[PDB]
Amino acid sequence: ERLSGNQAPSLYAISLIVVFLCLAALYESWSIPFSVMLVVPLGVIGAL
Amino acid sequence: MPNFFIDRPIFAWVIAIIIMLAGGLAILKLPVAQYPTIAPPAVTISASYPGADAKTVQDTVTQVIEQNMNGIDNLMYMSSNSDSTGTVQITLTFESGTDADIAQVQVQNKLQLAMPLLPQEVQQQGVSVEKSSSSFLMVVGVINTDGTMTQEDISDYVAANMKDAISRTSGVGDVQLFGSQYAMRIWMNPNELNKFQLTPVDVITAIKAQNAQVAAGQLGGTPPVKGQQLNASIIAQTRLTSTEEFGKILLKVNQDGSRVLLRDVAKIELGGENYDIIAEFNGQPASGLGIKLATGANALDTAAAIRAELAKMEPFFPSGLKIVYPYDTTPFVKISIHEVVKTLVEAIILVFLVMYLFLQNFRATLIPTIAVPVVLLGTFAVLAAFGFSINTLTMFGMVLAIGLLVADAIVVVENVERVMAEEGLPPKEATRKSMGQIQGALVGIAMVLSAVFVPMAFFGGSTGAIYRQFSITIVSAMALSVLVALILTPALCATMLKPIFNRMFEKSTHHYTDSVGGILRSTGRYLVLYLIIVVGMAYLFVRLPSSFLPDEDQGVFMTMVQLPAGATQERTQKVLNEVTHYYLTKEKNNVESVFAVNGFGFAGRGQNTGIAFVSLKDWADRPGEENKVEAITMRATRAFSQIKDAMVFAFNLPAIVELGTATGFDFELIDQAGLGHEKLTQARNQLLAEAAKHPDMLTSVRPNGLEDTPQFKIDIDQEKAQALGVSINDINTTLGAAWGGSYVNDFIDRGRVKKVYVMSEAKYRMLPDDIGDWYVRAADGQMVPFSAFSSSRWEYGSPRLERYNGLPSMEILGQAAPGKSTGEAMELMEQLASKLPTGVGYDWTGMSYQERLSGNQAPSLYAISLIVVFLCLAALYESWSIPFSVMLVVPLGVIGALLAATFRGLTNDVYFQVGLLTTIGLSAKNAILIVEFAKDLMDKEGKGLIEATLDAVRMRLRPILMTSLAFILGVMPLVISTGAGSGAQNAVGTGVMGGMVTATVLAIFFVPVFFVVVRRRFS
Amino acid sequence: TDADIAQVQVQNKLQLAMPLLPQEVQQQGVSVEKSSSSFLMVVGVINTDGTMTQEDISDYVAANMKDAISRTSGVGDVQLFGSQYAMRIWMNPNELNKFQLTPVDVITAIKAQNAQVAAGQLGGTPPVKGQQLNASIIAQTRLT
Amino acid sequence: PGADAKTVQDTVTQVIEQNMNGIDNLMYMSSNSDSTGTVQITLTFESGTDADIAQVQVQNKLQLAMPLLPQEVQQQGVSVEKSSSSFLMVVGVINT
Amino acid sequence: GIKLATGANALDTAAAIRAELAKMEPFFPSGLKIVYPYDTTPFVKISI
Amino acid sequence: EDTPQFKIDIDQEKAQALGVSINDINTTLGAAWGGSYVNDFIDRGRVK
């Protein structure tokens, strides 16, 4: 239990890096992925 | 594929970041050692039978064990020893790739079923099945300053307070002591045993009785009575804890009412379990801790954790006890890898300066400053995929790989700059024009260079384990370099490379094409000049000594004193006090410390054998070529030549401590017909005296074992022992326990189980006249001397007996003469051994076993190279006779390496053979891009075969000088470096840079010769 | 099933039971082995002249041939069609009767007088200061 | 058999535990020692380890501890089992 | 009589038994000869 | 939690003076109060 909750923050970090780079390698623009990595806090707040 | 990046510079940036993030989190999770596992897996059975000579050990322990080593998988050979110390060492060597944990359990399960077949005293000592990977990470020595703690006071403190937590602190493998802990120690006095009519048998019987453990049950146990209210586990007489309690042990009571106790006939100390080895550190007494390294651990992080833990023990020590470090190769592996990472980082700097010389724009020099450290990082990400480590072998694979990386980002980076010059193409339209040229002969670079290095990982058997460490890390830095040439390289030229020094007036005014155009007029005069190079490289290659790995200054060397036969422990301690005295009054300015071990040497463990762990100063505190181990061991061996009644040979460590040597063999001599030991020595002396009359082929031939020594036979008469009525199992027990020692049972000291030994006191077992002080009871109570039933004599016997594959043997070490190869010396030895007496065989072991089973692998895998390199170049061009123009550049790079190795004193070790193939790699890469352009100018234009060759050579002249000048200067500190780890980089650096001088100064002339001469033959 | 691990798991659970066996079973050798049910081959050894009997060949192919074949990789176990030599003592109940001897007295005499004895050393460790000699002491050996 | 819990603690349990180091993948150890004389030493490995590679690595350095144990343990035999702690099911048997 | 271990190749084992027997033949006493009265592996080779 | 125990303490030399052996004592105290596995028998075809 203190291994799940201790590595969780690093799961959220490397999962946001991958979805950022997969987005920039598809829609070209560096500003595109930044348009949508701002939408992640809008959906996390309803989850919790 | 590189033209898909017409409009995707970002998608090139994404998967460049992915390679830098795969390589970034790989370095932080990758093992760091000095060397990989080169030696094949080997498992050592160690048994011990105290008091026994070599024959009692062999006939009761050694043959019984090895008649049960069967059904074990992947076993190459097996070889055992039998000392007069009383020790067995059976080594079982397995094939490469054998799971050493699986093979070890199979060895110990066949031995666990053979434990009821061994003597009971061997079962009490316990056999050990350990994986022999003998590489001391670092030796923790422990000494007292003033001295109240003796040899065994320190060794018991280490094993009870220091050994347990060093076995912790993750990354530590097995630990191993220089000494033994305490034991309760009964020194018998045969005068009182004669006086009270006791034997040593009566002493042994009363100690097993009055020191035991009792199961006693419970109060209110199960089934109870009804209405029971109480449980209590009851405790009975436990083991003894103190020295005073052993003295009070009743032996017998005389009829007049007197107690005959143990301390009345003996004296009882608390001493070591054995007294065979005594260890000193600068003369004052010491202990020690050899430490091994685990799997998947760093060698730089455990030594930073052991030493960080020994600082958390130095408060709690007794006042006087400190820690020294007589053997620590970790500063050598810390510097010598950091001095290769400095070559990597200052290779990217020299790219940045060479390309600001030749090109005069800042925005172009950033482009190989990006693409070269991406492929370096991606090579670390693929070593973790294969499961490798950061070691010396895979870091010089980097250094040699940074000639290809430099050559893959100078080519095309330059070609984009060239098509922007002769026409005003914008930087995106010009980058596609470069992909019309450098695309197809760039994925042919990727596949010709695979066939140079991929059939090198298939070299087998503890020498191809070294070549596989180079061949993975170079094909990795060649496959990504191409992948980083089509992607994230062209992209960096379509962007950030903006359109449109009195040296260009000298460089571009070159009469090179005026020279080459006169060479093509006269090709026959220089075609025979090429044959002088082919014969010149086919002679310097043959006349060259062979080697494995260069000698290096470890900071620590060795010294081996070996006394004659029958020598004692004080007579060997006398010489080690004269060797320690040498290094502290004659070599004061070089050596910090000397750790003398009296008792153990190469493989014997007699009292006439000793060794010293001489550790030098820091390399920065010890300058000069005169102050290295190449000279210090030379200049001490001169000084230890006039010492008498000893052989004291100071020497340097090898590269891998557990390999053999080059130009040297390792020979066995088996008696496969039951001849005997004296029939095998006469076959051994016949072979050596016949191998000494071939001095031009065989040098330094010798036996590895020991020669026969006088030993003191005692001989019981049987009727004299029965007419007196004494039993032989009382006679042999009195002789064995007193003179040899007898482990009896255990006791508990400070909550720690420790042994109890029974042996005679030292002043009653030194001489053959002390036999007359030992009497034995008869059945009726008479004390009978040993002279009353037993004579004695002196006779020869073997202090060390060897067996090989279950049959007796005598190992023979030798080496080839200066100027001849090993297999020529190895076929002579088996022409001499076919003239031996009938029933004597031979076999090859060690490194000679590997060299025999892998004979035609070097010309048979390079034959598969030359077919695939031919086919991948016949694929690239449109003709079958087009590969020639390229394949004949191979003697042009090798000729400079064979010169640069003989004008310095080098040798074709494993660092010179990897350096050839990376100069064969660069000369063939440059030759492809010449005759690619010259073949395209014939097809897409109307160039007539000399207009094509001269046009293509002047437009490839500029990059072929950039990647040569960047990589001469890159490895140029490697040929000048001295001291700290510079043995390897002088070997890899010199054979490269002298070999690629003659690939850029002469290769730029013969490739335009070969492109024209070949296709006028096949027009 | 990985038969390497499946044969470790057998003699894991067998060495729990092995000290619960008769002593004569243990000193003959208990063996665990990964093998086929039937023979891969048979290697027959004959004598083409007649200087060796049937039990002279079986001793040679056990002392000199059986152990190196069983160390060859792939060989599960070896079945010898014969037996090697033993020192074979054929007692006689009438002379044992005539001298009031039993087979126990035969066995006890052989264990005493056929022994390989560990007898120590002259000048072994820890020595007296000034010791100048070191030599092994040779007591009884095996009968040959 | 028939030993105080402190006596098996320093003659048996610690003797095993200073040898159980260097085994690959190790999360923790937890041993116990009763007054019956019984000791079990759980060697919890980290998840993803082959439980049969780990069972033969804990076994080939258990066997170099038999030279250091009291000799009464070698007749009962010190086991090593691929282990478990919870019951999958209980099968009861009654009489009617 | 030679039993084959579990998993071992029958032809690689039989070819490795003949390599050991060839090393014992130089040291036989005179008149002693190896015969091959039963071998299941020549079927495996000659049928393929 | 810490149980009361019953340390019975067989003194050596008092037993040595009375003429008893310690090994007949220790197999008397153990067999009576704890029990002793002697050997095996066969109940309905099983070694018990």
Ligand SMILES: CCCCCCCCCCCC
């Ligand atoms: C992504 C590039 C992977 C390169 C892998 C190198 C393979 C080398 C094989 C050499 C023979 C074992």
